[PDB]
Write a protein that binds this ligand. Structure first.
Ligand SMILES: *[C@H](c1[nH]c(/C=C2\NC(=O)C(CC)=C2C)c(C)c1CCC(=O)O)c1[nH]c(C[C@H]2NC(=O)C(C)=C2[C@@H](*)C)c(C)c1CCC(=O)O
Length: 149
């Protein structure tokens, strides 16, 4: 029952990477300290795997929880041109991220986590249709989980 959650997470990451033809898609799920765990991952062969990593970034609890709960989407063509400072880039470096797309998963009016896509090693001008499909995907999976209780 509760473990059926995982089936949804696996679907989101696999479908997401297929939709975007990007290098990695993860579900990054928050605990009650807004520490995120990579609970699911679809990653093309040969790129670093983030699955099961716990990645604590205080920026979320300090700055961004409500914004994402309210539907914030961050598309980034080039992480080196996005005003992201070294303390941010340091987290993305090991995973070879160069472009990314962050969309929220909101369940029962609470920020469950984020669905995140990465393009490795090259910038990527995310398209309107790509952002819309990816955010839809996160919203759909969230609504399924919300309806299953
Ligand atoms: C907030 C922030 N961090 C992340 C992290 C990730 N992006 C990914 O792709 C992945 C998977 C590998 C992770 C994890 C995101 C998406 C955001 C939100 C960006 C936004 O919505 O604008 C954030 N963290 C930092 C680094 C900060 N954290 C630290 O531990 C230290 C030290 C830091 C130096 C300040 C920064 C700079 C941000 C954005 C600005 C901020 O909130 O301070």
């Amino acid at each position: 029952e509760l473990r059926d959650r995982q089936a949804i997470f696996e679907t989101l990451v696999a479908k997401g990477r297929e939709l975007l033809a990007c290098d990695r898609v993860i579900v990054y799920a928050f605990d009650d300290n807004y520490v995120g765990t990579v609970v699911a991952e679809s990653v093309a062969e040969g790129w670093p795997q983030a699955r099961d990593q716990v990645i604590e970034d205080p920026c979320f609890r300090e700055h961004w929880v409500e914004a994402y709960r309210q539907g914030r989407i961050q598309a980034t063509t080039d992480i080196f041109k996005a005003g992201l400072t070294e303390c941010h880039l340091n987290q993305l470096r090991p995973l070879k991220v160069r472009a990314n797309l962050v969309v929220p998963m909101v369940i029962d009016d609470q920020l469950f986590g984020l669905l995140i896509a990465h393009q490795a090693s090259e910038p990527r001008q995310w398209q309107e249709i790509e952002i819309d499909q990816f955010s839809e995907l996160a919203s759909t999976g969230s609504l399924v989980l919300e309806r299953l209780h």
